[PDB]
Amino acid sequence: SYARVRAVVMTRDDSSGGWLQLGGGGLSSVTVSKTEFLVHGERLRDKTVVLECVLRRDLVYNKVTPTFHHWRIGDKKFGLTFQSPADARAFDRGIRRAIEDLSQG
Numbered sequence: 001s002y003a004r005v006r007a008v009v010m011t012r013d014d015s016s017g018g019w020l021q022l023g024g025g026g027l028s029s030v031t032v033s034k035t036e037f038l039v040h041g042e043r044l045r046d047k048t049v050v051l052e053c054v055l056r057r058d059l060v061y062n063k064v065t066p067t068f069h070h071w072r073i074g075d076k077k078f079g080l081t082f083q084s085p086a087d088a089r090a091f092d093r094g095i096r097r098a099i100e101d102l103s104q105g
Contacts, residue, residue, distance in 0.1 A: 002032040003094025005087040009041045009051045010070065010079035019070070019079055022050055030080060032094040037102045039078070039095070053078050057103050061095060063088070071095070 007030050009022040028041040028050055041051025053073070061071040067088050070079030082088040 001094070002034070002098045003091045004029065004031045005080075005091050006030070006044065006083060007041075007087065007091070008081040009043075010068075010081055012077055019068075021081070027083075030091070032091065032098050034098065034101060037098040041080075051078060055095070055098055055102060057099060059099070061092070063092065 006027045008025050009028050009030070010019045011022040012018070013020045026043060026045055028043045030039065030041040030051060032039050037055040039051060039053040039055065040049065042048070043050050053076075056073045059071050059073045061069065063069050066085040067082045068079065069082070069088055069092060070077060072078075080091065082091065
């Protein structure tokens, strides 16, 4: 994998800019992997897949804080609360590396 962290998958709520823990939270094992480049989040407690995001070259990625990043592909929005700044940095690096490999021209 390009990155693997245990993080809380996030989703937008009905406020103008706020985020909630998807499904009420708990940790998921979130992997960025490689051709398709995927962000995959599997909830630890029951192995439910709660994040399945195929990466595209044009994504928008927002490091809102050192432990909260979100990204957008088209109008689809995904985010993570990380357990540490180190994890967030590793995840961001992995996304960037995946996009480097995806991009071919």
